[PDB]
């Protein structure tokens, strides 16, 4: 029936996006209940970003300096406070479109949808993963900050990312909704370089199962391997080490397809050592690593939401 | 700032999705104003699908046989009629969430977002193109039929696709919202094979411009070409022939980057003749053809919507 990189439907998050302007800076915020969440660097000028002292910059700001606009209607700020790298703007009206939601801090390897916004207005939606180096490979231009990453389970929106910074190398860094950066990144314009971008081995294996379920099977071979043996090969190619937990997580895909996890590892090994010789898998000429096992089961089984 | 395959935000379409059940068949419909649109094969059994006579099958159906459910609320069918391959179910309540919208029949090469649904509930969202052979490469399982494809311009939803059929080869066929199939496909379980899947040359060039704007430039060379010369090469590799209209459409990307369209064609030629030698472009090991020139400008410039 086919396999595609798909995002969660975005409507529940669309209804939470607002525009935050402090002085000459405009970016996005997230309106849940009577609180608007946005990056604290909204209070900075472009100059401030080299060496900002956020507590000091904050002292000069009052409730009325934060202009918050929900589509065409202005929201009244009745309180503000800084939590880590985010600002929480208390407004006098609960967002009537607040969905059921949680704040979750995800682990590397975990996937989520991003609703890219500009001036509190939604631009587009795409799927991302937290890379093992704690960056993400997004699509963000100036004014996109405060765009959020999320997952949905039936009717609950688990928000996991807010966008803050682009590194000189074109990749993206940001926070959870408590304002704590993923990785060692900070909201300052300095020399911060990303570490090694390793491949999320468990996600590649999940995606190979997805290929098999959809008819792409040329890469299945007559071999098997061990975790230890496979991991010697993974390390050489900058792949996350595979653990027994990962094997356990792939158990459902294993069961449905009748290909043992270690046999699929031997398929992956051979693809790493020999390449794809110009062939493709689910329409890709390289090995996709931004589907989780849970992603594969969900799109392959057709789970939906409130 | 990065470049990603992104769909339009899906909320406006989410609010139009309903479930249609006729007998033992459940699939999705689209509720706009006081009309629900759905595939006419909702009236078929699995057996009927080999050789259905839709007019005859329809005679046994009445308004009350169409069960239409909008989330948890039932809609009253007060009229029904068949238009080409779709059924229009007149209900007694206008959808309060009807967005501004149009019905457009797109051309091959044109891109759109699909909101995959199951039982009137949204599952996920992804970007697609009408292939030159009038198929699309989607992600659709049983019960997905009646899922729609759309574009948004600011506040207007232009619906262009409704999903009807999977061909034996794993690709997808469907109609415009007047119920007319794209291509020579029909809503009957028969031997219908897709034609040659040619690459959408104009979209590849657009995406190479996108790469250059984002820092990927290793494939720019010291050469140029002519339309005629380039097209000899395109034909050999099953690429759509490039026309002066295409060149004109790429004019804005040409202008912004200062790479002439024909110079970019010579880059493409070299990539076709020599391959990518294991390198990548915007994170792909093959040449993406499901971004339009207009797509590139939009994500690269940050256009948003009501
Ligand atoms: C593979 C999936 C899904 O259930 C699943 C995915 C991943 C898992 O880890 C577990 C389950 N099922 C869905 C039902 C399909 C029935 C079918 C057969 C032939 C033609 C048309 C339809 C057979 C495959
Ligand atoms: C390329 C895009 C966009 O406008 C566009 C895209 C495709 C077109 O066909 C036409 C225009 N612009 C956006 C503004 C950017 C300003 C900038 C420069 C340096 C650092 C940060 C920001 C420079 C590039």
Curated annotation (Swiss-Prot), chains A, B:
Q: Which reaction does it catalyse?
A: TSAVLQ-|-SGFRK-NH2 and SGVTFQ-|-GKFKK the two peptides corresponding to the two self-cleavage sites of the SARS 3C-like proteinase are the two most reactive peptide substrates. The enzyme exhibits a strong preference for substrates containing Gln at P1 position and Leu at P2 position
The name under which this protein is listed is 3C-like proteinase nsp5
The stretch of the full-length protein covered here is 3264 to 3569 of 7096
How is activity regulated here? Inhibited by pyridone-containing alpha-ketoamides compounds 13a and 13b. In turn, alpha-ketoamide 13b (tert-butyl (1-((S)-1-(((S)-4-(benzylamino)-3,4-dioxo-1-((S)-2-oxopyrrolidin-3-yl)butan-2-yl)amino)-3-cyclopropyl-1-oxopropan-2-yl)-2-oxo-1,2-dihydropyridin-3-yl)carbamate) inhibits SARS-CoV-2 replication in human lung cells. Inhibited ex vivo by michael acceptor inhibitor N3. Inhibited ex vivo by compound 11a and 11b.
In UniProt terms, what function does this protein have?
Cleaves the C-terminus of replicase polyprotein at 11 sites. Recognizes substrates containing the core sequence [ILMVF]-Q-|-[SGACN]. Cleaves and inactivates human TRMT1, preventing tRNA guanine(26)-dimethylation of tRNAs. May cleave human NLRP1 in lung epithelial cells, thereby activating the NLRP1 inflammasome pathway. May cleave human GSDMD, triggering alternative GSDME-mediated epithelial cell death upon activation of the NLRP1 inflammasome, which may enhance the release interleukins 1B, 6, 16 and 18. Also able to bind an ADP-ribose-1''-phosphate (ADRP).
Where does the record put the Glycyl lysine isopeptide (Lys-Gly) (interchain with G-Cter in ubiquitin) cross-link? 5, 90
Chain ranges on the Cytoplasmic side, renumbered to this chain: 1-306
Q: Which residues form the active site?
A: 41 (for 3cl-pro activity), 145 (nucleophile)
What does the subunit comment say?
3CL-PRO exists as monomer and homodimer. Only the homodimer shows catalytic activity. Interacts with host FBXO22; this interaction promotes the proteasomal degradation of nsp5.
Task: Explain what the record says happens when changing residue 205 to V.
Answer: In strain: Zeta/P.2
């Amino acid at each position: 029936s086919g396999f595609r990189k798909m995002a969660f439907p975005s409507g529940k998050v669309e209804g939470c996006m607002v525009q935050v302007t402090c002085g000459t800076t405009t970016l996005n915020g997230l309106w849940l209940d009577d609180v608007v969440y946005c990056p604290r660097h909204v209070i900075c000028t472009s100059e401030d970003m080299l060496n900002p002292n956020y507590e000091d910059l904050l002292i000069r700001k009052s409730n009325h300096n934060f202009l918050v606009q929900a589509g065409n209607v202005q929201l009244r700020v009745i309180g503000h406070s800084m939590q880590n790298c985010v600002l929480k703007l208390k407004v006098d009206t609960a967002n009537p479109k607040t969905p059921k939601y949680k704040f979750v801090r995800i682990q590397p390897g975990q996937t989520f949808s991003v609703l890219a916004c500009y001036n509190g207005s939604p631009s587009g939606v795409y799927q991302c993963a937290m890379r093992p180096n704690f960056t993400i490979k997004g699509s963000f231009l100036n004014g996109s900050c405060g765009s959020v990453g999320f997952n949905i389970d039936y009717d609950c929106v688990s928000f996991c990312y807010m966008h803050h910074m682009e590194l000189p190398t074109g990749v993206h860094a940001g926070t959870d909704l408590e304002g704590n950066f993923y990785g060692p990144f900070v909201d300052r314009q300095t020399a911060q370089a990303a570490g090694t971008d390793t491949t999320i081995t468990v996600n590649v294996l999940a995606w190979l199962y997805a290929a098999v379920i959809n008819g792409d099977r040329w890469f299945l071979n007559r071999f098997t391997t061990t975790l230890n043996d496979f991991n010697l090969v993974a390390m050489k190619y900058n792949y996350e080490p595979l653990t027994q937990d990962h094997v356990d997580i792939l158990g459902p895909l294993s069961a449905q397809t009748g290909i043992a996890v270690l046999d699929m590892c031997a398929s992956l090994k051979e693809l790493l050592q020999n390449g794809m010789n110009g062939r493709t898998i689910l329409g890709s000429a390289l090995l996709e690593d931004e589907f989780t096992p849970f992603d594969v089961v969900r799109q392959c089984s057709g789970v939906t939401f409130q």
